[PDB]
């Protein structure tokens, strides 16, 4: 019975492709051919938060845009005071191999996960002065790639198990297991609405998932190669994906077609982290060229570079108020970049 | 100044934290990191026993050299993407299920175990990160290879195999075949030492290889290369 199902499925793919072609009354290039380009945007290294003795993979920003969680292979998750470079905390990870880190919005907890197939939730605010691993929640059969908090009781974790799970911290079990991605997911950006989130799988595709009902609402077929980074546009109606195919594709949900593609001829190297500024006019993304070519979300022309690292830019975070961008690279040096005047 | 008692003690705490990090680095730097790779068909899980799911650590020491081996076969991901975590190791210890030439994959039996191993060593010996990260081949099951070599030749998997089906000749032929995937023979090395279950000299070989690699990187950073 496989053949008939495959044929009918091909029929619906043809129908949805016809819908995709029909909805595209005008490409975004035409709309943005008349906008005022920002211009040469240059940001200097305000601080190199040195002290992380190994390869940095993940960073995240607290909700006051003052505390940084940087995770590396020295088994260390360091919480840095961004304005003063002071090291607020030095969490001794249990498994030195790490891929993702997160900061609870209330600032009480930090998420940390990697090739251990577990996510460790550490409680920063304790009566004793040490940070204790509040919950070692496991169950994924596959490595973890991104962790994002929702309400200090549910955490969304994307795994190499071709799945993304919504874990209840207090109970310690996975409430919903979003499944359907062909390849493993290396990206997760919870929406500001805290109801949906996008998974960047290596199936060369992205997917929306609403967190309550559990099924994917929209699937986006994009890059030829595998998707390695994600972010959510601040409005919550769009998101942006980067890949080894050195293309940054911005999709919007109400129009499933790939809204825009940013890529130049000289760009070959892959992308590792993609983020957004508050206005959504920038897509600072960390490539393999040891830099952070920023791209305008609309005019699709490069606006600046944030070079200054001697290795991959692994994690590219942005302040919650849009005041600075952090470029935690494999260079073992977290760097804060703030535009001048 | 413009630094209160609060901020001053915060800086003292930062200095204490940095000192703890560097004290941890004291122990960390003395240990060298090896990645145990190879098809999970066999060979990978026996050299760990010879060295005396989640990421398996293997802390073993030899003559003041503290090796951290990492077993990864439980990761369960066909496409190799976590590999960039280990970029920075000094030895990719690849195990070749050499004896399995008469055996094919249980799933899709048209695919041979040896050809899968060759594709793996081609992907990892010429990976875009494991450029100069040297590789130690352990051609496992050398006892079974010696026993079976007269029974089944290599013609089944190797269309171009020719010569004598003797153990000493066929083993060298397959060793050369595996080393043929070395695009460059100067940035990295493919060491070779066929191993068996009772071979107690494997730890010696891995120590010697990692010693050579560490002296190699020391020469390179010193600019004498």
């Amino acid at each position: 019975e496989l053949d008939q199902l495959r044929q009918e499925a091909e029929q619906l793919k043809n129908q949805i492709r016809d819908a995709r072609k029909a909805c595209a009354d005008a490409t975004l290039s035409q709309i943005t051919n008349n906008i005022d380009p920002v211009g040469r945007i240059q940001m200097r290294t305000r601080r190199t938060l040195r002290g992380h003795l190994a390869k940095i993979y993940a960073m995240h920003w607290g909700t006051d845009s003052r505390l940084l969680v940087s995770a590396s292979q020295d088994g260390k998750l360091i919480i840095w005071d961004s304005y003063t470079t002071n090291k607020v905390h030095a969490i001794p990870l249990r498994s030195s191999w790490v891929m993702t880190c997160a900061y609870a919005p209330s600032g009480n907890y930090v998420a940390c996960g990697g090739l251990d197939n577990i996510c460790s939730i550490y409680n920063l605010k304790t009566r004793e002065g040490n940070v204790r691993v509040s919950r070692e929640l496991a169950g994924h059969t596959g490595y973890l790639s991104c962790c994002r908090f929702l309400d200090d009781n549910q955490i969304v974790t994307s795994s190499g198990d071709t799945t993304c799970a919504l874990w209840d911290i207090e109970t310690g079990q996975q409430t919903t297991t979003f499944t359907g991605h062909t390849g493993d997911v290396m990206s997760l950006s919870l929406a500001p609405d805290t109801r949906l989130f996008v998974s960047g799988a290596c199936d060369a595709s992205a997917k929306l998932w609403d967190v309550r009902e559990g099924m994917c609402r929209q699937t986006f077929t994009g890059h030829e190669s595998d998707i390695n980074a994600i972010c959510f546009f601040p409005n919550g109606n769009a998101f942006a994906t980067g890949s080894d195919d050195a293309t940054c594709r911005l999709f919007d949900l109400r129009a499933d077609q790939e809204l825009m593609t940013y890529s130049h001829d000289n760009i070959i190297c892959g992308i590792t982290s993609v983020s957004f500024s508050k206005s959504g006019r920038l897509l600072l993304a960390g490539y393999d060229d040891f830099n952070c070519n920023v791209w305008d979300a609309l005019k699709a022309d490069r606006a600046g570079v944030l070079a200054g690292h001697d290795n991959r830019v692994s994690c590219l975070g942005v302040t919650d108020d849009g005041m600075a961008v952090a470029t935690g690279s494999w260079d073992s040096f977290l760097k804060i970049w703030n535009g001048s005047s | 100044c413009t630094l209160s008692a609060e901020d001053k003690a915060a800086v003292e705490r930062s200095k204490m934290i940095d000192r703890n990090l560097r004290e941890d680095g004291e122990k960390a730097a003395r240990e060298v990191k090896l990645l145990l790779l190879g098809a999970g068909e066999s060979g990978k899980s026996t050299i760990v026993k010879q060295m005396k799911t989640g990421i398996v650590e293997t802390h073993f020491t030899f003559k003041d050299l503290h090796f951290k081996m990492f077993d990864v076969g439980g990761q369960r991901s066909e496409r190799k993407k976590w590999i960039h975590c280990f970029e920075g190791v000094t030895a990719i210890i690849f195990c070749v299920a050499l004896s399995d030439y008469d055996l094919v994959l249980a799933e899709d039996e048209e695919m041979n175990r040896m050809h899968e191993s060759m594709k793996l060593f081609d992907s990892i010996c010429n990976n875009k990160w494991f450029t100069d990260t040297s590789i130690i081949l352990f051609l496992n099951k050398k006892d079974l290879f010696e026993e079976k070599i007269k029974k089944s030749p290599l013609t089944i998997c190797y269309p171009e195999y020719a010569g004598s089906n003797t153990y000493e000749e066929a083993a060298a032929y397959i060793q050369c075949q595996f080393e043929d995937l070395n695009k460059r023979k100067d940035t990295k090395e493919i060491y070779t030492h066929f191993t068996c279950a009772t071979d107690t000299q494997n730890v010696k070989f891995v120590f010697d290889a990692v010693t050579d690699i560490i002296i190699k990187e020391n020469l390179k950073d010193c600019g004498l290369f």
Epitope: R66, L67, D81, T84, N86, V88, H89, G107, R127, E128, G129, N130 | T2, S4, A5, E6, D7, K8, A9, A10, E12, R13, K15, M16
Partner: single-chain antibody, 232 residues
Framework: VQLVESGGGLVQPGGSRKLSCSAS????????MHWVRQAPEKGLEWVAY????????YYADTVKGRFTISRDDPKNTLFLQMTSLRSEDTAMYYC??????????????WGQGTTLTVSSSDIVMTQATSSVPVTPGESVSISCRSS???????????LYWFLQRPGQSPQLLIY???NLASGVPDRFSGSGSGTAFTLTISRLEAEDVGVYYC?????????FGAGTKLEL
């Protein structure tokens, strides 16, 4: 968490002693530690502070040299050698823990304390009222007055409030006079105009009876206010 101290008792004038402070239930090595002096019926006074690892050791000018303060980290103990005592030192010493990072709550836990009886420039923190009649359910605000503005260029003003329950160790109420402590009812609050400050209380049950004290922390000569006694 427990911070029971030892020593105390009777001391002949001109003598010596050594307070031992036992710490349990928390990571001592990451906690700076201060001593606070409580004369038999007077207010509190800061004695000496040692940071984590004893990098910085500060004393009060009224006690400099005569006293020495150290911390045995592996045994989680706080030692205070008392050389050349005098009538000014018959008091009720308390052993306070403090941690110092962004968002920390210094002077969080206070110990039970031990009393010693001996036989026969800095910021001024003044509490003018020192006696206020209260009834449960009423909202009462206590103003403590500082010699200078306690506000740093870093955006924080460093005023602490403590409640001394009758016959009990001081309990943190608000740190940086804007951050409520942990385990304290939400009725307590604080706000101040840079150099004069008011701690506000929405309701005053029997648990809230006691003496309130204000504290500066910009400069290491930490100075306690006279506080206010609570009358029902």
């Amino acid at each position: 968490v427990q911070l029971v101290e030892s020593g105390g008792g009777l001391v002949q004038p001109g003598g010596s002693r050594k307070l031992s402070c036992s710490a349990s239930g928390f990571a001592f090595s990451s906690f700076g530690m201060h001593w606070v002096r409580q004369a038999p019926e007077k207010g509190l006074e800061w004695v000496a502070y040692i940071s984590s690892g004893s990098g910085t050791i500060y004393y009060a000018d009224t006690v400099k040299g005569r006293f020495t303060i150290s911390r045995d980290d592996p045994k989680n103990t706080l030692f205070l050698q008392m050389t050349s005592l005098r009538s000014e030192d018959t008091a009720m010493y308390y052993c306070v823990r403090s941690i110092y990072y962004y968002g920390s709550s210094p002077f969080d836990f206070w110990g039970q304390g031990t009393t010693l009886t001996v036989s026969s420039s800095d910021i001024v923190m003044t509490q003018a009222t020192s006696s206020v009649p209260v009834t449960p359910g009423e909202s009462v605000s206590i103003s403590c007055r500082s010699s200078k503005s306690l506000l740093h260029s870093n955006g924080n003003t460093y005023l602490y409030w403590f409640l001394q329950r009758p016959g009990q160790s001081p309990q943190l109420l608000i740190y940086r006079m804007s951050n409520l402590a942990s385990g304290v009812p939400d009725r307590f609050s604080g706000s101040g105009s840079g150099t004069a400050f008011t701690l506000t209380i929405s309701r005053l049950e029997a648990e809230d009876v006691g003496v309130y004290y204000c504290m500066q922390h910009l400069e290491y000569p930490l100075t306690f206010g006279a506080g206010t006694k609570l009358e029902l």
